[PDB]
Symmetry: C3
Subunit: 401 residues, 3 copies
């Protein structure tokens, strides 16, 4: 009877063990494969930056002041220079003249035109630029409008030009730019608004080229008077869609959290303000300075600060993250100050307050992948249900003999 | 015996693997919704406000702070500006002076920087916060403050989107004009100006003198964070200890507990920031016993305060960057607003931004690699075609 | 008897699929992040951004390295376009007076060693885990920045320095004086001059040479800089499973690059820069300027063909989180000024404090493991072949 018992058991094993599988298969489990290597021909990311100051004082015209005056806290609700102004006498005297609206006939005004004309000029800010031993120029930077206003992106990849690639670790295989933030052009700050700031310097965001920047939210800061080193590591993350995961596959061409937020924010403002901020996509009318102040700014602030319901984006199936390690040294040194001052025709003090050097590069281990993989596909299921029957057909043959 | 082995053999390998109690570590990095915002603790690098140090304070803590020598006199080697020296020489006049009960905790609580004075502005996710939103916590730096400590029983603060908007922004005034004159090197004085900050889970006490990060005056500092949840297995799979002075097990809680017992054992007192009910160390004890003792533990010790791994750890990845404050264009505004000079603003004001990136949540969990149920399935087929061949060889005989 | 040529036809088919998988040679990467005990403290190398102390540059030095340092033109004269303060210009015009001057043997290594910043002068204080360290605890190492120093180089045969707890207390703290008053006047742009003041630092395993001009991080004067670290051990598989190369004494990307760079310069310049290994003749200042510098720059900037190194099977990476506070505070300035015999302003421009330590979770491992070893292969078959060993005794 022992053989018969063995045969009976052989059936009861192909029963449990094959049932263990189908249940496990239908849980749609996954594994996450991690790897960190030194990739060759790494694709250099896009680098977007903004001057923390949105409007050059010297480009603000009488008409500009008339329309955007109250928005910039340079005027009160009755087109007068505020009682509570805190300006140096020379600038106050320049503004009091500008704010003289006697016999003044207002002329069509537009925030986008204002940003484009008054925003800091890359041609003036960019003192020097080098990528992998090659000299780059203002033309190598693309204009992109953000909430900070007129910003610039290096290696945007929208020119159809050949890819910029990194191959070795260290500053040499990266980007180095020397900027002049031009504090002498900073708009006087007389109050707190979404368009003014207490700070001097630039905001920077390193991002994949198929992903738009969200620099007011996700950027990092770089201060004047320093050379800042940014050692990076590219991290590629891949996710599975349902049933294995939660991701969504690809106004914008590729799906990204940012692209999703911008799209959502635009619809929200259009719905609640009947206008879009000038940096938003679409064809809705541009918000007036009054709309910015009364509706648009509060609306966008609500979304990026308090909102928990409206602009909630789902995970992309493909995300590229850039790990960053920042460090810095002082510029200029006492020994080099006079050289730089004479070179760019400034005072030594100006150099120390306005000049900055930014280095963006990758470390040796420049590439990391974190990919979700199907842990138990239909093929693996069979191979188990199959290899198990190859043991029951043997346990039945021995019984047969 | 040709199959009495192949059965046993291939059966043995899997059996051995189970009793090896193997594990796998599952990694995942996602954008979590309703992420729980951490606690943020900070200290002014200066421990005692110069203007709050009384004659009695100087008398007791004078030597500890290097403001007096061992004979209650202002040191020969003092390096102070004339105005401050003149203020101290008058404080240090102990003729006809009758000392009155003194203790370090009261001293810290009364002379330590006041959040009500340091906090110029505070916003969390578009909402204005206030000094009342900060809880007082005593550390080795003295009187410190924790934002979102979670000990009020108030509803949780949560983050949902990436970027500064969904985080905390505070503007601080470090008040250098209140910094205690530094005439020597002690564990209570420093050469630096600014604050120390530590981002930590709410069920984990801060160890800010050891694990904190610095934030400098004259800058706006951006701190982009990522929460990392790590889970470990206990024996036999791992080494961790599952969750006293403190409620949840953490390396820090363990160290603090250990340090306290060490000082009590060797100094018969505890530093004022330590838990328990042991007597507070006097300034003399601080100098002669407590400070050296604690320094030994956090610097040289390799035997006494060695803590075992917690089964549950929450780590916060940080990326710092900064811009300058104030700009030339905003200096006068800030100066007039807070009634200071433009130079003061540049030396004392700082802005701190603590927020999370889009991919805000990472999990690293140890999971058992070979569970008993898994073992049975692999061996089930052969285990029976051998136990059948076992009652079979005993059937032949 | 047909049932026998079936067992073989089943053992055959269970071998085939299994064999194929063994042939893809798959791998898995095991990750783990823990608080290690007795962690081995890394080596810390640092350089002053300034390569030559102004006061150590002699008439002979200026004569040979003058044009290289942009202090002289191609005719041994002080440049028309000099931008120096009058006192320094007057000191240099005197040095650059070569009337009746007979040049004497010069070499860049001696120049670096003699004129480079002295650790004995830069190091104001040094502590590791409660113990006072000294200039003798720093080893001299020549890099492209010139004369640099490495803490805990581990080449003395001394007992290992170990970390055990998280926080600054279990790490290194050094106070440096970068000595800007010694910085060489900058009159132009060269590979040996800089616009910046401060130091470059690189944290690295002791069996890996530094490549500090490329991979270092910066530390600024006037701050205390905190560097919270995490050691990350990465192990890779060689072919067929992976791409790595198994083991200068140990194989590392840096060691590979340095070796390659040296060969390249020797091949194209018939000399090596003074910080490079080997026994090739040292490059003259003229060679540096005309051949060596451009050559090395090409390699570390443009090259995509010559110095491409393959992945090591064993890599140690150090995660870093930097933060900073200001030094000195108004209240401590006078103390420091009096202590080191400087002015309060000097202190603010030259003094820096550097803290290098580890966090609680100080150790992370990322190891590639063979997914399917031979022993595991038999297991998936052994059973099928065992049910063939029985049908094999009932056929004979
Ligand atoms: C790891 O520890 C954390 C606490 O540090 C646990 O998080 C808590 O989980 C419980 C149950 O959901 C909640 O009631 C608490 O509010 C959570 N604390 C927080 C986040 O503030 C977590 O559950 C632990 N993980 C495991 C499974 O061990
Ligand atoms: C703004 O700050 C100034 C000090 O800079 C305050 O003024 C001093 O005020 C005290 C108390 O009234 C007087 O004893 C001093 O004589 C004042 N000094 C000077 C230089 O005037 C002033 O009170 C503050 N303003 C407000 C409204 O708080
Ligand atoms: C990876 O390489 C490191 C060296 O960089 C190895 O660490 C050494 O291990 C040996 C054997 O225990 C020790 O004698 C040395 O002292 C270690 N060097 C250190 C840490 O200073 C490590 O073993 C290698 N890992 C593997 C298994 O490849
Ligand atoms: C991820 O997206 C990038 C573009 O951003 C693309 O280059 C890459 O092929 C994608 N990876 C996969 C396989 O989804
Ligand atoms: C240099 O700047 C000054 C103003 O400071 C200006 O007057 C002069 O024209 C400038 N020189 C040149 C040649 O651009
Ligand atoms: C201190 O420095 C001065 C120069 O500023 C020097 O003359 C003096 O000798 C120094 N004092 C000592 C004792 O080293
Ligand atoms: Cl949003
Ligand atoms: Cl401890
Ligand atoms: Cl190279």
């Amino acid at each position: 009877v022992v053989w018969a018992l063995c045969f009976m058991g052989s059936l009861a094993l192909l029963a449990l063990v094959c049932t263990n599988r189908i249940q496990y298969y239908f849980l749609y489990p996954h594994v996450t494969k991690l790897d960190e290597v030194a990739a060759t021909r790494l694709t250099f990311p896009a680098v977007t930056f903004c001057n923390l100051n949105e409007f050059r004082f010297s480009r603000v015209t009488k008409n500009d002041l008339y329309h955007a005056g109250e928005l910039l806290a340079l005027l009160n609700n009755r087109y007068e220079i505020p009682d509570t102004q805190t300006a140096d006498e020379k600038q106050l005297e320049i503004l009091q003249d500008k704010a003289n609206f006697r016999n003044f006939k207002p002329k069509p005004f537009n925030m986008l035109e204002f940003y484009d004309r008054a925003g800091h000029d890359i041609r003036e800010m960019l003192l020097s630029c080098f990528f992998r031993g090659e000299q780059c120029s203002p033309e190598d930077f693309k204009v992109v409008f953000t909430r900070y206003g007129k910003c610039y992106t290096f290696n945007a990849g929208q020119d159809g030009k050949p890819r910029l690639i990194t191959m070795k670790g260290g500053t040499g295989n990266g980007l180095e730019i020397m900027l002049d933030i031009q504090q002498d052009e900073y708009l006087p700050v007389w109050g707190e608004t979404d368009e003014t700031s207490f700070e001097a310097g630039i905001k920077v965001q390193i991002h994949s080229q198929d992903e738009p920047p969200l620099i007011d939210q996700l950027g990092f800061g770089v201060a004047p008077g320093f050379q800042t080193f940014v050692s990076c590591q590219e991290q590629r993350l891949i996710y599975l869609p349902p049933p294995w995961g939660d991701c969504k596959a690809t106004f914008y061409d590729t799906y990204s959290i940012t692209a999703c937020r911008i799209d959502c924010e635009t619809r929200y403002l259009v719905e609640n303000c009947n206008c879009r901020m000038v940096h938003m996509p679409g064809d809705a009318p541009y918000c007036t300075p009054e709309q910015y102040k009364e509706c648009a700014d509060p609306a966008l602030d609500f979304l990026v600060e308090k909102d928990n319901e409206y602009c909630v984006c789902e995970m992309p199936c493909n995300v590229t993250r850039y790990g960053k390690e920042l460090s810095m040294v002082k510029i200029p040194s006492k020994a080099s100050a006079k050289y730089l001052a004479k070179k760019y025709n400034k005072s030594e003090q100006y150099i120390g307050e306005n000049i900055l050097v930014l280095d963006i590069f990758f470390e040796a281990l420049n590439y990391e992948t974190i990919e979700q993989k199907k842990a138990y596909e239909v093929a693996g299921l069979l191979g188990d249900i199959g290899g198990q029957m190859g043991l029951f057909i043997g346990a039945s043959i021995l019984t047969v003999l």
